Ligand binder design. Structure first.
Ligand SMILES: Nc1ccn([C@@H]2O[C@H](COP(=O)(O)OP(=O)(O)OP(=O)(O)O)[C@@H](O)[C@H]2O)c(=O)n1
Ligand SMILES: Nc1ccn([C@@H]2O[C@H](COP(=O)(O)OP(=O)(O)OP(=O)(O)O)[C@@H](O)[C@H]2O)c(=O)n1
Ligand SMILES: [Mg+2]
Ligand SMILES: [Mg+2]
Lengths: 180, 180
């Protein structure tokens, strides 16, 4: 059994899904991102244990909720027979076994969009489903010295602190201030 | 066009993929995780622009490399016609449009594996493809006071710092020390 488009309305959440909390800010970004390029990773479901002809989401609740807000009529699914232990395992694995992109690898990606493909920071924001603010701030990090970038490449400079350092009117000045 | 199993050997990487660096530590965890439950999210590819009957990975290089080390003969793929702008966009989106699990939501998930399903910390480690160390340290956080957990629930307490705080013989003592 491969992956198929299926009517969004015949899908339901597992209450015992490892993820409890869902921030509006993030869900808005995903629904925006889905409105543009659609649902890119198919949603993992098992046949519903409670209701007939329904599917219980094993992995991809945010995708389902985002696609709902985005007003998509169908979603891509993969149906696999799974017991309650399998689902909890998979639920953890999909979210735990994945490496985040370095904020500089992200910034460089935006540079290439601008230079090689002549995309404005607005064009980028609209396509990737993030704010013009986030894009601008992310790219400003490319200005910083090689040494401070090496701190972000290494992780020494906190990834959270990076977005803050970027927002500053005098961003490079906050490099030495990071020590204290 | 859905998703199909395809021989791992007819897949190649895009050199211009947003992600440049690949840490051995993480790739080992993924290959372990894949050795157990296989490749859970199908790998997004376009028909190779250079070589005939080959596919260029748009999203899922780590999965491909992990599955390779894991000695998988086939991998699940989805083939879509995509130009160089599409691929760079999608490459960014799949990695940028996704929310990480709270370290406490992770710990609780492991608790339920132990209590509801009678899994040892070794059983968990083997199935999720992480270290017994990582599992033990992650669960120890559930012991900590509601106040310091609120710091991790909020994010104030660095998620990386959490596993370290947990390992400490006197973990709660690091709460006031989080001033610096
Ligand atoms: N047994 C597993 C473990 C993990 N994953 C998935 O593999 C992906 C790993 O994400 P990432 O670190 O970004 O690597 P890839 O997407 O494989 O590669 P890249 O982003 O570099 O293209 C995640 O979707 C995760 O759910 C999976 O399909 N099967
Ligand atoms: N246009 C987009 C944007 C993002 N994604 C994918 O949506 C997932 C978001 O991951 P996460 O934040 O964990 O949410 P879900 O996996 O959807 O939900 P859950 O983990 O709660 O099951 C990622 O694999 C990302 O590649 C996608 O398919 N299409
Ligand atoms: Mg997920
Ligand atoms: Mg990825």
């Amino acid at each position: 059994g491969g992956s198929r488009e299926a009517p969004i309305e015949i899908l339901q959440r597992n209450p015992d899904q490892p993820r409890r909390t869902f921030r509006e800010e993030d869900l808005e970004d995903l629904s925006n991102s889905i409105r543009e390029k659609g649902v890119l990773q198919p949603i993992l479901v098992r046949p519903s244990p409670d209701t007939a002809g329904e599917y219980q989401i094993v992995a991809g609740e945010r995708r389902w909720r985002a696609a709902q807000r985005a007003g998509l009529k169908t979603v891509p699914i993969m149906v696999r027979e799974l017991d309650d232990l399998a689902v909890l395992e998979i639920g953890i694995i999909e979210n735990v076994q994945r490496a985040d992109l370095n904020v500089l690898e992200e910034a460089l990606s935006y540079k290439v969009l601008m230079e090689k493909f002549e995309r404005t920071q607005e064009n980028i924001a609209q396509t990737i489903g993030k704010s013009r603010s986030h894009v601008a701030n992310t790219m400003r990090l490319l200005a910083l010295p090689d040494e401070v970038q090496s701190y972000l490449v290494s992780g020494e400079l906190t990834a959270g602190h990076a977005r803050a350092i970027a927002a500053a009117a005098d961003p490079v000045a906050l490099a030495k201030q990071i020590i204290e």
